[PDB]
Curated annotation (Swiss-Prot), chain A:
Component of the CSN complex, composed of COPS1/GPS1, COPS2, COPS3, COPS4, COPS5, COPS6, COPS7 (COPS7A or COPS7B), COPS8 and COPS9 isoform 1. In the complex, it probably interacts directly with COPS1, COPS2, COPS4, COPS5, COPS6 and COPS8. Interacts with EIF3S6. (Microbial infection) Interacts with vaccinia virus protein C9L. Component of the COP9 signalosome complex (CSN), a complex involved in various cellular and developmental processes. The CSN complex is an essential regulator of the ubiquitin (Ubl) conjugation pathway by mediating the deneddylation of the cullin subunits of SCF-type E3 ligase complexes, leading to decrease the Ubl ligase activity of SCF-type complexes such as SCF, CSA or DDB2. The complex is also involved in phosphorylation of p53/TP53, JUN, I-kappa-B-alpha/NFKBIA, ITPK1 and IRF8/ICSBP, possibly via its association with CK2 and PKD kinases. The gene is COPS7B. Belongs to the CSN7/EIF3M family. CSN7 subfamily. It is found in: Cytoplasm; Nucleus. This is COP9 signalosome complex subunit 7b.
UniProtKB/Swiss-Prot annotation, chain C:
Component of the CSN complex, composed of COPS1/GPS1, COPS2, COPS3, COPS4, COPS5, COPS6, COPS7 (COPS7A or COPS7B), COPS8 and COPS9 isoform 1. In the complex, it probably interacts directly with COPS1, COPS4, COPS8 and COPS9 isoform 1. Interacts with CK2 and PKD. Interacts with the translation initiation factor EIF3S6 and IKBKG. Interacts with ERCC6. This is COP9 signalosome complex subunit 3. Widely expressed. Expressed at high level in heart and skeletal muscle. It comes from the Eukaryota.
From Swiss-Prot, chain D:
This is COP9 signalosome complex subunit 1. It comes from Homo sapiens (Human). It is found in: Cytoplasm; Nucleus. Essential component of the COP9 signalosome complex (CSN), a complex involved in various cellular and developmental processes. The CSN complex is an essential regulator of the ubiquitin (Ubl) conjugation pathway by mediating the deneddylation of the cullin subunits of SCF-type E3 ligase complexes, leading to decrease the Ubl ligase activity of SCF-type complexes such as SCF, CSA or DDB2. The complex is also involved in phosphorylation of p53/TP53, c-jun/JUN, IkappaBalpha/NFKBIA, ITPK1 and IRF8/ICSBP, possibly via its association with CK2 and PKD kinases. The gene is GPS1. Component of the CSN complex, composed of COPS1/GPS1, COPS2, COPS3, COPS4, COPS5, COPS6, COPS7 (COPS7A or COPS7B), COPS8 and COPS9 isoform 1. In the complex, it probably interacts directly with COPS2, COPS3, COPS4 and COPS5. Interacts directly with inositol kinase ITPK1. Interacts with CAPN8. Interacts with USP48. Interacts with ASB4; this interaction negatively regulates GPS1. Belongs to the CSN1 family. It comes from the Eukaryota. Widely expressed.
From Swiss-Prot, chain F:
Zn(2+) binds at residues 115, 117, 128. The lineage of its organism: Eukaryota, Metazoa, Chordata, Craniata, Vertebrata. It is an enzyme of class 3 (hydrolase). This is COP9 signalosome complex subunit 5. The keyword Electron transport does not apply. GO terms for biological process: exosomal secretion; negative regulation of apoptotic process; positive regulation of DNA-binding transcription factor activity; positive regulation of transcription by RNA polymerase II; post-translational protein modification; protein deneddylation; protein neddylation; proteolysis. InterPro entries: CSN5_C (IPR040961), JAMM/MPN+_dom (IPR000555), JAMM_MPN+_peptidase_M67A (IPR050242), MPN (IPR037518). Its main location: cytoplasm. GO terms for molecular function: deNEDDylase activity; enzyme binding; macrophage migration inhibitory factor binding; metal ion binding; metal-dependent deubiquitinase activity; metallopeptidase activity; transcription coactivator activity; translation initiation factor activity. The gene is COPS5. Its EC number is 3.4.-.-. It comes from Homo sapiens (Human). Belongs to the peptidase M67A family. CSN5 subfamily. The CSN complex is associated with some 'Lys-63'-specific deubiquitination. Such activity is however not mediated by the core CSN complex but by the BRCC3/BRCC36 component of the BRISC complex.
Amino acid sequence: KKDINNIVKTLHEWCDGCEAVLLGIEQQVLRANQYKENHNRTQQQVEAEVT
Amino acid sequence: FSFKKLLDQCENQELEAPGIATPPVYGQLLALYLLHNDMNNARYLWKRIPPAIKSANSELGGIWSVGQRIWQRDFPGIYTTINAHQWSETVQPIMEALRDATRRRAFALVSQAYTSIIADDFAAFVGLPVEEAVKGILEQGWQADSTTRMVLPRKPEQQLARLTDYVAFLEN
Amino acid sequence: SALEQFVNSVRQLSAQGQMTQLCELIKSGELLAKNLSHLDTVLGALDVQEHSLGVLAVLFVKFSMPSVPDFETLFSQVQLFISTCNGEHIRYATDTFAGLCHQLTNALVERKQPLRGIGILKQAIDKMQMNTNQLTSIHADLCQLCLLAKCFKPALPYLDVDMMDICKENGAYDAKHFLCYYYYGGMIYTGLKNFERALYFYEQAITTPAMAVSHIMLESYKKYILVSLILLGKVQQLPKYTSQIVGRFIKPLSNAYHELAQVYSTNNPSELRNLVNKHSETFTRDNNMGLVKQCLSSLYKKNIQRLTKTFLTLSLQDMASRVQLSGPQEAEKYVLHMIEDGEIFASINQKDGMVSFHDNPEKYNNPAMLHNIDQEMLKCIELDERLKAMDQEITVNPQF
Amino acid sequence: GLISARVDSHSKILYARDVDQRSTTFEKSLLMGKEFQRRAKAMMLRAAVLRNQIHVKSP
Amino acid sequence: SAIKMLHSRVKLILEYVKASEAGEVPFNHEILREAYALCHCLPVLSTDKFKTDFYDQCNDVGLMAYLGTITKTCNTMNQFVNKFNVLYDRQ
Amino acid sequence: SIDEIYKYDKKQQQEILAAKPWTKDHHYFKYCKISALALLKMVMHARSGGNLEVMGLMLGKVDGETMIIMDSFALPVEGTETRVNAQAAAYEYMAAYIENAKQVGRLENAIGWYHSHPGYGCWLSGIDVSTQMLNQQFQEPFVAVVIDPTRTISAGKVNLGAFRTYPKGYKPPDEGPSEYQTIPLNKIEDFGVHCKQYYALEVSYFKSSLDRKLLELLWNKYWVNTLSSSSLLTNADYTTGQVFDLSEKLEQSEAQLGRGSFMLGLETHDRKSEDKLAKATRDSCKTTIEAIHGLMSQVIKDKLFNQINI
Ligand SMILES: [Zn+2]
């Protein structure tokens, strides 16, 4: 019988679990990419220097 | 913490008094060391403290006797050096603290070091007697052993950070 | 009394042009009368800035009453400069400042209190040394002092850091600063019993370029190979880029530890004590007695570690023959050590006093061990990063 | 000899040790890691002693 | 594939259970039994042994990966040393 | 317009095709406007090619100062990286294709050479440097379009270089990239023989707004796949060979860093220069990054599958 409250409450929770852990990896990647940007950035800077 | 806090304070005491500090400063340093079970730096201090001003702290005399014991660690004699003087504010309020530290310490000794333990062992270790020992094995969940005294002390993103650091290293 | 009007000139250099020879001229006679105090009276141009070292060295110009109560008063007074305006420009007159600090060390080790200079002056030291508790001149001084007042913890901030970018700064430094300071470190992590750290210290000091002989080097040899045998399981091998003159000079001098490693191989307590009486001089020489008990500790190390992987559990009286357990009951205190001194995967089978080897610490099967690996990672990553930076810098070299 | 084995000499029996791949690998791994790290600072300080141009003059 | 497929699917499912509450859709037992078993088994695969061996994975992987990174570390070490040899090492 | 560059002005394109600016300066072509067909089957047919080297005709055009790769990809063939002018033999592809491509309004004509060195690149080796040089004296505008499949596997970026090689008589001026790359024993010597005879084109990419929306919507249901890599399972004992190769990859460095020859340099043959340590460097980087692949894959799958929430 009428479970709607619990079930409806519930979908997001599971989603949250994946969302949180997956996000953590995501940001770690993001920051890593940011490092990529600085690394490539500095690489480009040296490129500019060579001319 | 009170152990570490008081010991650092007594350190500053010795540092700023002169290597000539207060004899109760000395006994407090040494008692705090033994609270931390210090045996070598305590011996530095003993080889770094004025022995005249040491004996000025006869409480420190007993404290260095106790440090000798903790250097040897025959237990009833350790507490007898303990139970020679019991001086509040330089000795005894951390005398109790150190007998309790020894309680947990020789407690793990019983548990982990002793597969089986003689109740006389921890009866010496902090003074907790053999019937106290039965109570303790029963309270922490440790098997008693009668007729032998071989009582049984019962032994009781983040990863994406490291991985993106792998990458950032290779992808420097 | 022409030692008065230097305040105006220093104001004409402090907050002005050069301060280096401003601080290292006092010219002035260099051995003066009360005017030294009068230079101490009127030499501080603006404040207790860089030039107040001038006032300090002028007070040194006497060297009469060196560590008299000024040994604390001027001490804090020096700390005044060391605190007020020691400045990152500690090194206008680098070597002069260094030797002056050594003069402080001279007077104090001489007289009264080798206790409290550490933080009182490491203010300006770090105003000189940058990152890794980096050895400028006064570090030999400081470890000297804490060796007098045997409290080595306060320099353990400086000690435990295996310093790099060491602030020799090409002046205000001597090779004996390294020598003294790192034999200090070896001594301390001997007493501290981080013997492998001293092994590192003395192996570096010996493989460091050298031509002479020294009980600096001889005792580096000493505590190093003590680590190799007393600490370590048995004889350390010859390092890679060792100095020539050792084999030239000090290696033939090394009969002490020739017989050391020999008798260590021998496992003879009698010849142990014989070599002990042999080098009882070095036993006594620097409060370093008990080296024989150290070698005996290494003996029991050899015996035990031997029996470790070979057995699971043994009779202590039988192993009283094996390790020299002195009967199972002295072996009882020994097993005490085993579970005690971080010595065995085993517990007190006190029913039979049995001691079962396990060696079951980790498969890194706890993530905290994984983070052990992680800090391994931290070290090696920043290590490679500085390798790249320095590789750059050799590229930064002016080529051709 | 070939002894990949153990003996509780209290037991009076031999007990062939199983050849560890995983944690023996861990052993050697962090062993060489510590060796490399010691030598890391070591070579840093050797680069120092060579750049600092320090040699123990005989006299 | 499963992940983001059912990601959009279950975003739909959140809107969709809001509808089955109500929406159109009336109160819905399809949602009830079906998504009940689904979500209230979740987070499924969150078991122990299982994640124990997951960390065993992680140990071996981080091990060998940092092994290679150590190799690269001592690599750049030798790089610097060779530039040294070029400019500095006179042997 | 976003579609302004997708406009294949066969008029304009074939105009600059017959323009011959390279015969005036062989460094005119600085850009390489590409449509992602290059990436398309270049990528998945170097990867689907296993390790079998390939060759042929690229679709494309020219715009301003720009070579344009409308197409590049692989064969199910071999022999490239060692064939005497390999690429030619696949041009029969758009010996037909482009022709009746014009029947749909693909009035383009043939422009280049599709290819792939599955596992170790897309380029022209020693004998294919005979290929590359001969053909750029044969076929200019000609390019050494260079991207490595397994490098783009363990790298996460498309190192695309349109390498108009410097024809015989024309040396690298100010701008000769000459992308040095770790070559097998077969062609490293001839790369040293010809490593500085080519420059790269400024390889840009052109598309439509529908293209961006399609890739975003791709991700918008591929993220589920993202948390199912599911990367460790793919190379179970692969890495063993990798490891057993990688240390030998490291012994690569050993191979070129082992030697007793004192003297002044490499002073006998190119070694050269202390050596192959850079080879093992790229080796360690790629292999630890594929470990990163496996671990992030399985671990983040745990992060989402095993436990997120109820
Ligand atoms: Zn060819």
